[PDB]
Amino acid sequence: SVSKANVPKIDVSPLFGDDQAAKMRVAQQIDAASRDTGFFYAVNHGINVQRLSQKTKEFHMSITPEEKWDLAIRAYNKEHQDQVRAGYYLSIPGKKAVESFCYLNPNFTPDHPRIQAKTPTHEVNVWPDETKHPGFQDFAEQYYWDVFGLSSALLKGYALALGKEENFFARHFKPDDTLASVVLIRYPYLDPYPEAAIKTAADGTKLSFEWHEDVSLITVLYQSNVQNLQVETAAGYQDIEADDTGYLINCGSYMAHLTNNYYKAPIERVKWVNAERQSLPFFVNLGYDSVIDPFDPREPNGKSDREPLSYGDYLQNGLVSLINKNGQT
Ligand SMILES: CC(C)[C@@H](NC(=O)[C@H](CS)NC(=O)CCC[C@H](N)C(=O)O)C(=O)O
Numbered sequence: 613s614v615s616k617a618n619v620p621k622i623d624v625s626p627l628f629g630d631d632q633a634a635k636m637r638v639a640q641q642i643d644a645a646s647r648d649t650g651f652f653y654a655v656n657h658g659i660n661v662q663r664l665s666q667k668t669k670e671f672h673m674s675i676t677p678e679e680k681w682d683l684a685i686r687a688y689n690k691e692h693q694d695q696v697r698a699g700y701y702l703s704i705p706g707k708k709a710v711e712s713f714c715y716l717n718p719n720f721t722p723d724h725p726r727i728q729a730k731t732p733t734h735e736v737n738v739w740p741d742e743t744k745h746p747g748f749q750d751f752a753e754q755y756y757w758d759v760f761g762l763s764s765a766l767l768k769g770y771a772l773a774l775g776k777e778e779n780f781f782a783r784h785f786k787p788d789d790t791l792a793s794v795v796l797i798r799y800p801y802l803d804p805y806p807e808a809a810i811k812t813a814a815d816g817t818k819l820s821f822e823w824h825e826d827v828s829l830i831t832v833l834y835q836s837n838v839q840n841l842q843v844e845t846a847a848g849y850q851d852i853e854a855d856d857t858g859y860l861i862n863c864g865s866y867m868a869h870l871t872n873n874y875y876k877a878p879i880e881r882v883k884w885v886n887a888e889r890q891s892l893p894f895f896v897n898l899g900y901d902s903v904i905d906p907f908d909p910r911e912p913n914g915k916s917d918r919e920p921l922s923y924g925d926y927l928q929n930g931l932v933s934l935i936n937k938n939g940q941t
């Protein structure tokens with residue numbers, strides 16, 4: 613028997629406005645959700661998620677093996693030593709079902725001083741041929757900024773929820789240096805589905821991806837309408853209901869650190885489902901040198917002894933660890 617997680621739907625539209633009290637009522641809901649299962653669905657968010665899913669689908673179903681190699685990250689193509697994060701993540705028929713395409717801040721160009729300095733976790737995006745994928749780069753870049761704008765508003769809600777001024781997080785979330793990423797993930801329908809691509813949890817559940825905590829400040833996730841996600845609670849894993857009009861939001865482990873675990877990063881996993889579906893996370897990362905001073909909302913004086921963590925160092929450590937624990941995606 614598996615229970616269902618309480619994932620409230622929160623109308624986030626006041627966070628784009630100037631009704632301060634209405635923004636506090638949103639913040640209260642974010643607070644409650646963050647202290648309960650850790651998840652909520654952001655609704656009335658203003659993003660055209662039908663176009664997002666449509667363009668994503670066109671890309672996944674039309675890219676060829678030749679293009680995948682040409683775009684592949686270093687884990688699949690030794691020629692691409694600079695592509696640790698951005699690029700195509702190939703499936704392995706018979707062994708690995710999932711495939712995906714990751715891109716970063718469009719402002720990371722050869723002109724960018726972080727690229728000039730070769731700072732870790734910064735890369736220039738790679739893209740397919742425009743004539744073979746008309747409109748795809750423009751769509752993807754536009755979506756990055758559309759979801760950046762939503763995430764900025766959500767971060768105002770999280771700041772208010774923790775008793776802070778509304779820019780406490782968002783001031784560090786900037787288009788010129790954000791390390792945030794979009795991943796366009798395809799989960800395919802396969803018949804027969806390779807058992808090699810299915811993992812079995814301790815509790816016997818068949819999984820496509822084992823338990824993990826997000827490496828992010830927050831995670832802003834769109835998925836098609838196929839239930840798959842679960843969140844761990846003390847009483848076991850609970851199913852997260854699907855909603856292909858909303859964004860599923862949760863705090864990442866950077867948030868857990870800076871709030872002294874008041875807003876924990878939920879432990880989540882992906883059930884195996886033999887169904888064609890899409891999973892499109894936006895990982896809200898800050899700048900490489902962004903440092904948020906920890907605090908403890910449980911203490912009268914709000915004082916935490918936790919060390920201020922530079923975000924870039926945090927991101928580098930978290931992404932290599934996630935690969936080491938749950939395998940190369
Ligand atoms: C909804 C999630 C569980 C989704 N998985 C994911 O988002 C996966 C596994 S946790 N994410 C990652 O591994 C981290 C990707 C980070 C990205 N390459 C970058 O350099 O910024 C899924 O649907 O599999």
Ligand SMILES: [Fe+3]
Nearest residue numbers: 824825826880
């Ligand atoms: Fe996740």
